[PDB]
């Protein structure tokens, strides 16, 4: 009956901080992947378990589009089997991931002259994230032997840190907007390609 709403994900004015990454469930629509695969805006279009162009000729039970901002040198963390602070503490993809990682440089929208900025990441966590898990807590992190009991102090750290997006940053430190499409075959396919 209708086309899937990728526009509101990819062209949103605002993107989430990675620790609070946004998820949009894509269901009951025909997905026209052509606008995406044939776009020139994306500096990364990395697909797992599917050729990017046979998407319009396959059906899936549920499609998710996850969106957030990270640094350019962190895009490589959005992949199975990664071990950096982004994969461990912010956004984790499974070994059996099927989908595409799409990213583009967003320096013109997400950086401002001063440093101090609003995009955050989680620095510490008691354990690593499970795949597709989200942690938005702000509990004080106990790095030492004594419980913090909600009190910030030495060895008791606030767990979120800001990215310092400045327009003059090198490309590896500039903000990138990322959309992760994940396609699962679990049940009846409600999202299908136009072929």
């Amino acid at each position, epitope marked *: 009956t209708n086309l899937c709403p990728f526009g509101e994900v990819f062209n949103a004015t605002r993107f989430a901080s990675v620790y609070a990454w946004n998820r949009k469930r894509i269901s009951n629509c025909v997905a026209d992947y052509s606008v995406l695969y044939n776009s020139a805006s994306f500096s990364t279009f990395k697909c797992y378990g599917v050729s990017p162009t046979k998407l319009n000729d396959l059906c899936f039970t549920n499609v998710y589009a996850d969106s957030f901002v990270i*640094r350019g*040198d*962190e895009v490589r*963390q959005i992949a199975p089997g990664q*071990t*950096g*602070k*982004i994969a*461990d*503490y912010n956004y984790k993809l499974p070994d059996d991931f099927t989908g595409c990682v799409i990213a583009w440089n967003s320096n013109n929208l997400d950086s401002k002259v001063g*440093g*101090n900025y609003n995009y955050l990441y989680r*620095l*510490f966590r008691k354990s690593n994230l499970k795949p597709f898990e989200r942690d938005i807590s702000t509990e004080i992190y106990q*790095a*030492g*032997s004594t419980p913090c009991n909600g009190v*910030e*102090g*030495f*060895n008791c*750290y*606030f767990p979120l*840190q*800001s990215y*310092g997006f*400045q327009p003059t*940053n*090198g490309v*590896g*430190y500039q903000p990138y907007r990322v959309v992760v499409l994940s396609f699962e075959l679990l049940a009846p396919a409600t999202v299908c390609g136009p072929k």
Partner: antibody
Amino acid sequence: QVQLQQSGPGLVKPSGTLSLTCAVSGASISSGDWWSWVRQSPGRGLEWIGGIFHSGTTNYSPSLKSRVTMSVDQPKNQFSLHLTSVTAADTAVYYCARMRGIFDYWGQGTLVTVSS
Amino acid sequence: DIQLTQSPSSLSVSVGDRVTITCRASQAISNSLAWYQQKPGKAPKLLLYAASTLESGVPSRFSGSGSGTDFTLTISSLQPEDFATYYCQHYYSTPFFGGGTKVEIKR
């Protein structure tokens, strides 16, 4: 990246006061970070000196506490180290650093020579 | 205070060789352990923390493991630019830096 720009004279006479200032860019002093100083001299390796929270709470190496003072200036987004009654043993490269458990960003370092 | 010691204090290895550096804590420190690379004339650079979590932008040949008192830094394949002194540091209590492991290149 967060940039820590260090300033202050590198030559200090014995018994004088070492004074260094770190200017922070790309990050705000008003954060849950400990604005810290670490020094390095041959044989001693890296030595944590101390850190200061934007609230003014301080945590100093106990071997140096009596001689160490740190301060923060939020409107200028900077912080400072003062080390009094310096001896030859205080000759070192002094680094400022943003610390929250880890020292993730470092200044360029200032070579401090205690000499007459 | 809780202290750290590194072994070996210096090693000389060929380009492409696997490098294993040990950091031992005088008391258990959970996984509050980080590793730094310091090239000559430069500030230390953070490689790993929480024992095994890589800092953003750090090359994939570096990894860490360990919990409690025994920690390991691994360089899976040494490159010539990896000449440096490698330091461990814990943040379980008063921050403390290990003595450093000087990595030289044999050719």
